[PDB]
Design a binder for this molecule. Structure first.
Ligand SMILES: *[C@@H]1O[C@H](CO)[C@@H](O)[C@H](O)[C@H]1NC(C)=O
Lengths: 198, 596
């Protein structure tokens, strides 16, 4: 029903289950499935230990910023994607659940930061950003700005200004007693014939 | 601390709110225009007041920035608009009076009431009413009477307010480091950027007179032709000694000569090109008008319409109580949203209007990626030219035959084209002498080189000199004729209609050169040519990010304001006009009048 904000994204840890990378690739309601790493059809071949899921709610054509080695305002100080990305990014249209008539200002994004974010780091603390040598010493003043600004969402913004929920999946390729796997085979059975059994 | 870097934060925080605030403002305006009801009048007022209160907050802080050391030419230009002092430089008791006079002028200008003296209960208004009297009639004792009645009861009350308004506006302009109020209207035709592309406000005043003398023989020929045609119908009232009278142009002010086309037709045997019944016979609705005409924008390579325009914007059929304004408008609401407000019908004129409106929409979409402070053209004289390029190059017989609306057996002759060349000539170059008149008049009166008494005497002595309009009835200094104009009382500049003519034909000829078209210019089209879609696109997307002088290099050969195509487009017109005034004298003397 609801997803975490782009400045403070959720972190879902998935392990100890059968991975099904078949319906995800087969659904037609996925505006973006391009991803870098292993083949999207070879996913049900490797076995991993941990799977990480990150959820974002961003605005339209901005979704191209999420890539291994792209700069901007979401991939620089809001969510830094590692250069050696080993997961996949899925984005679909969410104009029917994220847009409200009159504006939906409940999705805040950070706009001010003093340094570029390292891969997989969170800055949830909200403090007024100082630009120069003028501390506010109060509630609001000059050289005082709030990093968090709420997104505007209405059902009619065209194409490039519509909300587009994004899910990023990170697979770790460490050497360990991996458990996360997928359905291997369901081949039929024959009797009384010299065969190779596995 | 640092001053150059910190401004980036301010301009990145201001425009984020400006974009969406203007978005709700545009949406409220569209709702009010679509729904004529008291239930939608408070919201638009509230949105306008909120936006006005927000604009002042973000413009007051943009004076502490020393806009003489910032390196980049983009942020400096962006902050220059925020640095404008506006009208908040006067005293509050003075600003209140100036605003009251400005509102009173507009309110009174729409309260024209003149009753017929013999039937004192019958007044007529500037709207339908007195307008119809001079628009289509065949009489001489009534057209002058309507002119006199209109110009003798509206000026006597606008003059006292305008007298103080001019002085107060000049005083307000003085506070912005300008010599007069003319600099406040010439401020957009000025660039101080890249070397070799620089411009000055003092250059346009001498450049406006050096482009009008080269088209004066054409106006002399057209005036001689129309005077000769009027001598063939009207009785012995017009004289070859002087020139054409005042109340026979076809309008109250004489801006357009469209009402004289029927009276001044060379040959009446051949009718005009009409295809309205051609569309009606095939049962074309207004949606097919928008669908069959958008395809002309596709063959040239221009991008397609975004989804939502065909759903949000109303196309036609107001019908029932759901009344809407029928004024043709194109709205760029922001956030990627575009709409059209038009009561489209089955008309070739409506076809041209639809082309004009979606041309405005295309031009608005061209620079959609520019920042909010740069979501406009380099200058304001580009929108109309962009809208009218396709209006001009969309009525050619080849274009209509390609769609499949006329039979392929059409046999146009020379006279079929002479009337089409004359109909556009009577409209285009028929208003140019009235623009250089009013605009130069306002510029000189705002300069103040003339005293208070010598105000109206110069207007009539210069109107006869250039345009050639004699006084039909004598008027004294207390009369105020030009105050009975739309762009004289609402503080509207009257220079946007003069460079538009040059821009239209410059762009048309420039696009026709690299389009494989040989021969005349009136039968040139850019349809089915992607080569005409690449040269134009390099300038449409620039918006206000680049100066207009620089922008006039990638589409046209030269940047200078030289009126070449007008002496080339109407070449058959001149060739036919130089053979008709063989024995008739061409010119006028500023001494003959109907009354003396
Ligand atoms: C528009 O006006 C009509 C009455 O003309 C009114 O019933 C309606 O509430 C108004 N607003 C909308 C959105 O239709």
């Amino acid at each position: 029903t609801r997803f975490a904000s782009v400045y403070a994204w959720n972190r879902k840890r998935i392990s100890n289950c059968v991975a099904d990378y078949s319906v995800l690739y087969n659904s037609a309601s996925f505006s973006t499935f391009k991803c870098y790493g292993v083949s999207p059809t070879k996913l049900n071949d490797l076995c991993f230990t941990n799977v990480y899921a990150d959820s974002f709610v961003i605005r339209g054509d901005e979704v191209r910023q999420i890539a291994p080695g792209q700069t901007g305002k979401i991939a620089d100080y809001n969510y830094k994607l590692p250069d050696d990305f080993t997961g996949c990014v899925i984005a679909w249209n969410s104009n029917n659940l994220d847009s409200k008539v009159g504006g939906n200002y409940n999705y805040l994004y950070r706009l001010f930061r003093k340094s570029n974010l390292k891969p997989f780091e969170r800055d949830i603390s909200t403090e007024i950003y100082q630009a120069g040598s003028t501390p506010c010493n109060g509630v609001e003043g000059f050289n005082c700005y709030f990093p968090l600004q709420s997104y505007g969402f209405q059902p009619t913004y065209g194409v490039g200004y519509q909300p587009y929920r994004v899910v990023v999946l990170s697979f770790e390729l460490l050497h360990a007693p991996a458990t996360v796997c997928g359905p291997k085979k369901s081949t039929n059975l024959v009797k009384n014939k010299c065969v190779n059994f596995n | 601390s640092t001053i150059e870097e910190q401004a980036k934060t301010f301009l990145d925080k201001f425009n984020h709110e400006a974009e969406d605030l203007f978005y709700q403002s545009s949406l409220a305006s569209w709702n009010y225009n679509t729904n004529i009801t008291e239930e939608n009048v408070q919201n638009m007022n509230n949105a306008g007041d909120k936006w006005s209160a927000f604009l002042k907050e973000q413009s007051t802080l943009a004076q502490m920035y020393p806009l003489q050391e910032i390196q980049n030419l983009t942020v400096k230009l962006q902050l220059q608009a925020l640095q404008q002092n506006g009208s908040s430089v006067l005293s509050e008791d003075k600003s209140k009076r100036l605003n009251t006079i400005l509102n009173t002028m507009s309110t009174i200008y729409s309260t024209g009431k003149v009753c017929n003296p013999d039937n004192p209960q019958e007044c007529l208004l500037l709207e339908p009413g007195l307008n119809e009297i001079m628009a289509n009639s065949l009489d001489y004792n009534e057209r002058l009477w309507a002119w006199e009645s209109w110009r003798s009861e509206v000026g006597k009350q606008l003059r006292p307010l305008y007298e103080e308004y001019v002085v107060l506006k000049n005083e307000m302009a003085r506070a912005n480091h300008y010599e007069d109020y003319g600099d406040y209207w010439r401020g957009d035709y000025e660039v101080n950027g890249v070397d070799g592309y620089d411009y000055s406000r003092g250059q346009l005043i001498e450049d406006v007179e050096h482009t009008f003398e080269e088209i004066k023989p054409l106006y002399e020929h057209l005036h001689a032709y129309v005077r000769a045609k009027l001598m063939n119908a009207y009785p012995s009232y017009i004289s070859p000694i002087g020139c054409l009278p005042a109340h026979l142009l076809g309008d109250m002010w004489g801006r357009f000569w469209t009402n004289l086309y029927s009276l001044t037709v060379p040959f009446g045997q051949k009718p005009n090109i009409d295809v309205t019944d051609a569309m009606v016979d095939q049962a074309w609705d207004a949606q097919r008008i928008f669908k069959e005409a958008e395809k002309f924008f596709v063959s040239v390579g221009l991008p397609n319409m975004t989804q939502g325009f065909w759903e949000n914007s109303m196309l036609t059929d107001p019908g029932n109580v759901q009344k809407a304004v029928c004024h043709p408008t194109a709205w760029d609401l922001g956030k990627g949203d575009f709409r059209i407000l038009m009561c489209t019908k089955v008309t070739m004129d409506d076809f041209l209007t639809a082309h004009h409106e979606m041309g405005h929409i295309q031009y608005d979409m061209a620079y959609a990626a520019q920042p909010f402070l740069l979501r406009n053209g380099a200058n304001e004289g580009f929108h109309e030219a962009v809208g009218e390029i396709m209006s001009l190059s969309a009525a050619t017989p080849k274009h209509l035959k390609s769609i499949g609306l006329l039979s392929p057996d059409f046999q146009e002759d020379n006279e079929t084209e002479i009337n089409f060349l004359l109909k556009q000539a009577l409209t285009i170059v028929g208003t140019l002498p009235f623009t250089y008149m009013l605009e130069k008049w306002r510029w000189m009166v705002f300069k103040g080189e003339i005293p208070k008494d010598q105000w109206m005497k110069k207007w009539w002595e210069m109107k006869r000199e250039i345009v050639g309009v004699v006084e039909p009835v004598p008027h004294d200094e207390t009369y105020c004729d030009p105050a009975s104009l739309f762009h004289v009382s609402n503080d509207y500049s009257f220079i946007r209609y003069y460079t538009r003519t040059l821009y239209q034909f410059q762009f048309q000829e420039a696009l026709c050169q690299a389009a494989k078209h040989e021969g005349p210019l009136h039968k040139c089209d850019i349809s089915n040519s992607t080569e005409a879609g690449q040269k134009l696109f390099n300038m449409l997307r620039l918006g206000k990010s680049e100066p207009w002088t620089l922008a006039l290099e990638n589409v046209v050969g030269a940047k200078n304001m030289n009126v070449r195509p007008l002496l080339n487009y109407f070449e058959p017109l001149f060739t036919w006009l130089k053979d008709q005034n063989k024995n008739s004298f061409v010119g006028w003397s500023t001494d003959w009048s109907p009354y003396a």
